[PDB]
Amino acid sequence: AEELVLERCDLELETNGRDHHTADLCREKLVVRRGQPFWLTLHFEGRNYEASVDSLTFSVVTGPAPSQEAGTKARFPLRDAVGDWTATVVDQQDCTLSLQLTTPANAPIGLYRLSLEASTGYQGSSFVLGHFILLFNAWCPADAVYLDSEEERQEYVLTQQGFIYQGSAKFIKNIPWNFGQFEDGILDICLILLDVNPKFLKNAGRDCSRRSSPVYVGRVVSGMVNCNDDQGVLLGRWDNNYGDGVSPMSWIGSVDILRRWKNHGCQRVKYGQCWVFAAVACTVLRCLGIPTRVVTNYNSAHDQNSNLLIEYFRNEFGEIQGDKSEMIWNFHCWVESWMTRPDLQPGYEGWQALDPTPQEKSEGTYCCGPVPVRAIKEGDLSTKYDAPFVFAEVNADVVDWIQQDDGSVHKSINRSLIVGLKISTKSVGRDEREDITHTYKYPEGSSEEREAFTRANHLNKAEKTGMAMRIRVGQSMNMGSDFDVFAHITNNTAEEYVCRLLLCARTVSYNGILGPECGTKYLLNLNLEPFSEKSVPLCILYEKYRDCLTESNLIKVRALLVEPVINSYLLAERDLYLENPEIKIRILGEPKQKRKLVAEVSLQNPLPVALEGCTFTVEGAGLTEEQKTVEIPDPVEAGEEVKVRMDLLPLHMGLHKLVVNFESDKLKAVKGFRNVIIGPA
Amino acid sequence: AEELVLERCDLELETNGRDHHTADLCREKLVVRRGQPFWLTLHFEGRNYEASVDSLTFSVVTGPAPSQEAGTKARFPLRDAVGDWTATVVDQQDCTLSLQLTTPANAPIGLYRLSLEASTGYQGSSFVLGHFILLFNAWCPADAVYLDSEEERQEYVLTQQGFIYQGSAKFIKNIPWNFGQFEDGILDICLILLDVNPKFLKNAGRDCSRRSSPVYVGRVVSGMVNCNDDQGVLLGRWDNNYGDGVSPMSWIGSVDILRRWKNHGCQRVKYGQCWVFAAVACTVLRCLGIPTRVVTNYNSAHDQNSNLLIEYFRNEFGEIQGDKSEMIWNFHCWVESWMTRPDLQPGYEGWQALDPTPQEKSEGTYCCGPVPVRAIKEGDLSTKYDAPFVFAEVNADVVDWIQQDDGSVHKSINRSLIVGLKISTKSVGRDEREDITHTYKYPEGSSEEREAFTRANHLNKAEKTGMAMRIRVGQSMNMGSDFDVFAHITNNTAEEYVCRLLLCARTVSYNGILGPECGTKYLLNLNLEPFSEKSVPLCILYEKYRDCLTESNLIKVRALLVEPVINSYLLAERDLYLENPEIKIRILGEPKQKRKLVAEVSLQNPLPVALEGCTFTVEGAGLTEEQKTVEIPDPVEAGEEVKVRMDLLPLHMGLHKLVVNFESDKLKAVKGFRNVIIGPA
Ligand SMILES: Nc1nc2c(ncn2[C@@H]2O[C@H](COP(=O)(O)OP(=O)(O)O)[C@@H](O)[C@H]2O)c(=O)[nH]1
Ligand SMILES: Nc1nc2c(ncn2[C@@H]2O[C@H](COP(=O)(O)OP(=O)(O)O)[C@@H](O)[C@H]2O)c(=O)[nH]1
Ligand SMILES: [Ca+2]
Ligand SMILES: [Ca+2]
Ligand SMILES: [Ca+2]
Ligand SMILES: [Ca+2]
């Protein structure tokens, strides 16, 4: 009469991980997404259920201080048909009972402890079934992070390899990145990352209860990448002397960054920069289920303190004399996260710009975001989370002053530089770049742009010698060779002029730091004939820039054309990206799941001098569980090619993007990638 | 005593089709590759083998007139260990006997009839086990068509969707093509194609015996595409009036072409052009196992009768007055097949240029090929199969004569046109274009090129006013809008000139046919100031070219600059490709094998006028067994976008390239493609 119910072999079906799009994550722990029912199988050694005999209720607690009011702890009874924490009986057969548990769409994210309390009237018992991790659901309708396009959900959540776009605005290069959010151990690393955040240390219960909202999780996640004081994922150095750590450009996948962080206590890992911060932030948010895409903005006005107007003071040569002034970044990277905003006036649901790179502010040094991109486009700077900084970054106006020899400065015309240019992020389902510049700004000169700027109360700036000049490069220039770049002057006036044109080309880092000039040509008496174009060539030599070039291979050409009669100053500036040698990747053998695959990577040295200490680094999520590195024994000469073969074992079927990086003493951070389609065994 | 051996349920294992890389082809018929052993399972209803009791020999015949000397018929006995037609016993279990049959590497290709003659001493019997198709093996070492790189074998044989590169040399567009060699029924269509060829009609036995060599099969296959008289796959019209048939540019996959051919008796299908001939030839050869890649050559000297020197006579405006003269083709397509050549001096193994497009010759009208590309590069025109024609196509010299008003003609300088330019074919394993121009020609001005030209006994042609002119387009121009193209003159001489510059832009077809001019600007007194560049603009209007534009969207700009003092003629010509509107393709639902998948295709109309009778055609090998076509009910207006949804059921897992074509009255043959990765069920 009324025998105690005893259970054994509780199994949390890994088939529901395919249902929850957490298939890769379901390795020795059950990971599911909120707002969606997940299968649960219970095995007993007696009566299968005996509902008319036994009543049992589930209790789940996630935080260290679980609270029912806070939403971190909830207990629910079992019923045969449907607060939104619901456990229901799908079926009973043999000695096995099959249940379907449902989590609320606003449930907090984190590790959960599942306990069952089965009291059959008299007596009864309580014990823990297991542990599971609840992530944001991009497929669950009414979840804050919901995407209506399945391809969009797949690319912005499930896809582990993508492109980080960098280089120059005129010539954009897609550097491959392996986000690898589902690489082994990363989810626990992200949970540790959240569990050591300042809000949690201050009040763990408040934080764990507040982790339901994607906006809070995004703020914390981006903050944990090299933003706040004490613990962080990365440490930032911009001075181009990364001797004691991994170079910022050397990175090819964020997986090793997180692994380095957790393995060495929780010390900031090596050296990181704006793209690295955005890439690891996107890895964390994608792992946690928040749809996130890394975005690059070219000619970005970073470090200005939310400033719409930047004034540059230049000398007679056009070089900027400011010692306090911060230069326009060649490009800046930040992330965008797809979520709904219930703390703002309705209609701001969508892409939110989270900038994990710390920005200078009067309040202090701290990363901006998340601000709806809609606010930036409409100029609604009153929106809560760091709207003016991002808007100023995209829509800053730059004014170039040239110092006259007599007293005051004179205004020059620079039409070659436009801020917030060629905003780009990887397209959904393709390798092509998607230009999202329209998402942040309206078309220039439109009524809609005018009203949006008026909303920011920023209506300033559009001209007053019928001449123009721009920098032209002709055909492409590869890194490691001397090449010519031309300064093209277009005179469409009856007047014929004698002028002074000053050309200076300087090795420049991606964040605007200018090194010493690698090319200089000054003409004090240049004759511009009427209604004609004149092109003055500047020869840039490999030897002149080799020592002081960045790892971003950026070189800035500046030209200043002065008409003396009317004393008119015309300025043209353009950033060249010296192209690295291509990496030729050959896949050897038939590519199949859990089958040895050989990848042969080779590059042909493009320098006059020999390359020494060459090292190939290869990383892929689904292609190799661990990063593969090969060191080349002997130096590689001027003509010679470096070719090596690395064995990989891919355990995931499907498309994966293998990223390769070659590093040498004279050539650094040359990237390559190859799409690999793994078949079934 | 000595019971008769009776067999039943003979099964030709479809698992060996995965072994033979014929997995897609193994549908209700066994297709295997020569030079490799294929599994065979025999079921009996008595003694499993009783070798000490029964001796049985296999006999296979392929042709209609099988001959042992010819190699079309061969009979071989069964032994337990290894003429190269070998049947051996791998294993015996229960009532089942498992054999492994081996075909010779030089075995002829075609349909084979497998017969077994089992005589157990006294009596015995004979009967047919089944039918199988033997194809070229690119994986079998020592087979003539052998590739050492697995990726190369996969792309040049197994890959069913690729790119046909066309457009202009300066701006190359990759048109997607669905070769679909493994699409249902195509292999039988190709065998019918071979079985109706002239050599077979003349002497079937000789042809079937000669089908062992890939060179013979290639000659016949390329011939059957619109080359020889009577039966052919395609019929060619170049006059741009394809009313009664499918347009040459409308095609997106060669599968429908072959199906149209066989379904309607064997009548030439619709209208075809050089790329169509090459595409169907590549489909046939890839289906038959010969590694083949379609190759495009820009500024190709086709229809010249193997001529290394082409003379053009032009008027005062630079327009070509020749009424007999054939113009330089903007681009020409042909195929390349990988095979060894035993009919030539050793060392010509490799890519063979087969040009299925019929070329004018003194002997008659007939397609060239297969000539080793090595011969073209080395200038060894004595090589057997149409070497001088292809070499002349790539390395022809063009001389432009401008007729003087007084008597004779005067020689002009055209540095804007170089023949055999930007030779390109789809890369192996990627969508990127691979430039194979180096494969046909050595670097200009090198000693190796000089000796190669000397081998062709073609050493002619490199100049004698320090001026130059080229056509510049600035930013891209989309089709359906007016745009400006500039004629850029560079004077680097102390002399200042007054000159006459004549600009004429004419709608041009891809094979050089020039329609009426859509832009004209003539300046009789243009002033070029010293040491300066002058750009003269020509406005090309949509209304001016809409009626007479080709389906290739090609427009040829011609500029003639005449200096009168020294009477120097400078010529610049360039072909623009008006870019079509992009097709935005959205994949809806999770993509899985044998699961309904929705593809939404949409394009935004780029014309001033409305589009009527819009029709979307969608084709994919592995995505749809049959071509899917949707007709848009109402006209699409100037602003509006055309968007439609087509259900597809993909039955093959893996990567497939879905090709889409949109056709309307005002916009024609706009292409798009999307890579689709089909997961398992
Ligand atoms: N500006 C720039 N152009 C590059 C770079 N690398 C290659 N290119 C080539 O430069 C060409 C584009 O130059 P463009 O913007 O048209 O200059 P312009 O036409 O002379 O005014 C392309 O053919 C590119 O392949 C680079 O780092 N910067
Ligand atoms: N020549 C040509 N250029 C095109 C076409 N369509 C787009 N373009 C654009 O033209 C630019 C390249 O022109 P380029 O060869 O550098 O001319 P140039 O620098 O003015 O002498 C690229 O930015 C292309 O995007 C076309 O059909 N023909
Ligand atoms: Ca988007
Ligand atoms: Ca001008
Ligand atoms: Ca090749
Ligand atoms: Ca000049």
Q: How many residues does chain A have?
A: 681
Longest dimension (CA), chain B: 112
**What is chain A's percent helix, strand, coil content, to nearest 5?**
15, 40, 45
**In a shared domain, residues A289 and A196:** yes
B549 and B597 both lie in a single domain = no
Q: Which residue has the tokens 């007016």?
A: B482
Domain end, chosen from A422, A447, A466, is at: A466
* Residues B310 and B366 reside in one and the same domain: yes
Statement to judge: residues B85 and B174 lie in one domain: no
Q: What is the spatial distance between Cα A389 and Cα A396, in angstroms, rounded to a whole number?
A: 10
| Domain identity same for B317 and B368 | yes
Burial B63-72 (b: 16+ CB within 10 A, else e): beebeeebbb
Choosing among A147, A158, A491, A532, which should be mutated to test the B contact, i.e. which has the most B CBs within 10 A? A532
Binding region of A for GTP: 470-477, 574-577
Sign for the CA dihedral angle at A274, A278, A284, A288 comes to positive
Nearest CA to B277 among B291, B290, B298, B292? B292
Based on the fold, state whether residues A169 and A237 are members of the same structural domain.
Answer: yes
Residue whose entry in the numeric block shows the structure tokens 């000595």:
B2
Show the DSSP H helices in B586-674 as ranges. none
Which of A531, A547, A581 terminates a domain? The answer is: A581
Cα A30 to chain centroid, rounded = 27
B599 Cβ partners below 8 Å, 6+ apart? B585, B586, B587, B588, B618, B645, B646, B647, B648, B658, B674
Residue B360, H or E segment: strand B359-360
Q: Which ligand is nearest to the Cα of residue B476, counting in written order?
A: 2
Residue B457 assigned ligand-binding role: no
How far is residue B335's CA from residue A657's CA, in Å, rounded to a whole number? Answer: 31
From the list B54, B34, B41, B47, the residue with the least C-alpha distance to B14 is B41
Distance from CA of A564 to the nearest CA of B (A): 20
How remote is the CA of residue A575 from the centroid of ligand 1, in Å? 10
CA distance B58 to chain A (A): 33
Structure tokens at A292: 């996130």
B330 CB under 6 A from ligand 2?
Answer: no
A529 vs B529: CB contact, 8 Å cut-off?
yes
User: Token pair for residue B277?
Assistant: 């001939």
Q: Is A233 left (phi over 0), alpha (psi -120 to 50) or beta?
A: alpha
The residue whose two tokens read 């190269």 is B84
Same domain, A246 and A287: yes
Q: How far is the CA of B380 from the centre of ligand 3 (A)?
A: 55
CA A280: distance to chain centroid? 7
- Closest CB to A654 among B527, B530, B679: B679
Angle subtended at Cα A663 by Cα A662 and Cα A669, rounded to the nearest 5 degrees: 75
CB contact under 8 A, A529 and B533: no
CB pairs under 8 A between A and B: 66
Contact indicator for B510, B614 with CB cutoff of 8 Å: no
Structure tokens at B402: 């401008």
Residue type, B493: T
Residues B555, B586: one domain?
Answer: no
Q: In what order do the strands lie in the sheet with A433-435?
A: A371-372, A350-354, A329-339, A292-300, A421-426, A433-435
Cα A218 to the chain's mean position, in Å? Answer: 13
Tell me, using a 6 A CB cutoff, whether residue A476 lines ligand 1: yes
Please confirm, yes or no, whether B20 is among the known catalytic residues: no
Residue B140 known to be catalytic: no
Type and span of the H or E element at B592: none
Is residue A245 located within the same domain as residue A186?
yes
Place of tokens 């060191």: A631
B420 in the same domain as B356: yes
B576 is annotated as contributing to ligand binding: yes
Type of residue at A597: L
First to last CA, chain B: 53
Closest residue of chain A to B654, computed from CA coordinates? A679
> Looking up tokens 């990352």, which residue turns up?
A193
Using the mean position of ligand 2's atoms as its centre, give its distance from the Cα of residue B518 in Å.
19
Query: Which residue range(s) make up the domain with A534?
Result: 467-581
Give the C-alpha distances (Å, rounded to integers) separating B309 from A153, B381, B397, B458.
59, 16, 5, 9
Number of compact structural domains in chain A: 4
Please give the number of the atom of ligand 2 that sits closest to the Cα of B577: 27
The one-character DSSP state at A235 is E
Question: What Å distances lie between residue A551 and A228, A242, A247, A328, A548, CA to CA?
Answer: 26, 11, 9, 18, 10
Q: Are residues B47 and B26 in the same domain?
A: yes
Mutate to test the pocket of ligand 1, among A171, A536, A553 (most ligand atoms within 8 A of CB): A171
Q: Are residues A27 and A169 in the same domain?
A: no
CA distance linking residue B83 with residue B189, whole number of Å: 31
Q: Pocket of ligand 1, candidates A476, A489, A575: which has the most ligand atoms within 8 Å of its Cβ, to mutate? A: A476
Asked, as a colleague might, if the bond just before B370 is cis with ω within 30 of 0, I would say yes
Q: Which of A122, A144, A166 is the last residue of a domain?
A: A144
* B278: nearest Cα among B291, B299, B293: B293
Contact B150, A595 (CB under 8 A): no
Name residues with Cβ closer than 5 Å to ligand 4, which is an ion. A 492
Gyration radius of chain A's alpha carbons: 29
Helix (H) or strand (E) holding B485: strand B483-491
Breaks in chain B (C to N > 2.5 A) come right after: 82, 461, 464
Kindly give the pairing relationship between strand A309-314 and strand A397-403: parallel
Give the residue on B whose Cα is nearest the Cα of A429.
B675
Q: Do A653 and B589 count as a contact with CB atoms less than 8 A apart?
A: no
Separation between Cα atoms, residue A406 and residue A411, nearest integer Å: 14
Among protein residues, the one with the nearest Cα to ligand 2's atom 3 is B171
Chain B residues with CB under 8 Å of A675 CB are: 429-430
Output the CA angle B294-B296-B300, nearest 5 degrees.
Answer: 140
**A462 CB-near residues (< 8 Å, 6+ apart):** none
B549, two tokens: 């534009």
Q: Which residues of B touch A496 (CB under 8 A)?
A: 529
C-alpha span between A338 and A336 (Å, rounded): 7
Query: Which entry of B208, B274, B367, B368 is annotated as an active-site residue?
Result: B274
| A274 a catalytic residue | yes
Q: What is the dihedral sign for C-alpha B166, B170, B173, B179?
A: positive
Residue A623, amino acid: L
Is B533 in contact with A534 (Cβ distance < 8 A)?
Answer: yes
State the DSSP string of A464-501. Answer: ---EEEEEE--S--BTTS-EEEEEEEEE-SS--EEEEE
Check B654 against A674: CB less than 8 A apart.
no
Give ∠ CA A367-A372-A373 in degrees, rounded to 5: 100
Q: Is B444 annotated as a binding residue?
A: yes
Q: Is A468 in the pocket of ligand 1 (CB under 6 A)?
A: no
Which atom of ligand 2 lies at the shortest distance from residue B472's CA?
20
Nearest CA to ligand 2 atom 9: B476
Identity of the amino acid at B362: S
Amino acid identity, position A296: T
